[PDB]
């Protein structure tokens, strides 16, 4: 599942422009980006169409 989360434990999970979100797939909190940033966070600054409609 998907949670809106992301405390100070980390340290700027999201870093170059991305917001933070939280996931219950394992309570692990993830990251997006935008073009040219993406994955965990903001760290896969590269391409690759990552969005639908």
Do not use: A
Not at 10 to 38: A, F, K, P
Request: aromatic residues 14%; glycine residues 12%; charged residues 20%.
């Amino acid at each position: 599942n998907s949670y809106p989360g992301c405390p100070s434990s980390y340290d700027g999970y999201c870093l170059n422009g991305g917001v933070c979100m939280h996931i219950e797939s394992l309570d692990s909190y993830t990251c997006n980006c935008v073009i040219g940033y993406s994955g965990d966070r903001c760290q896969t600054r590269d391409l690759r169409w990552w969005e639908l409609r």
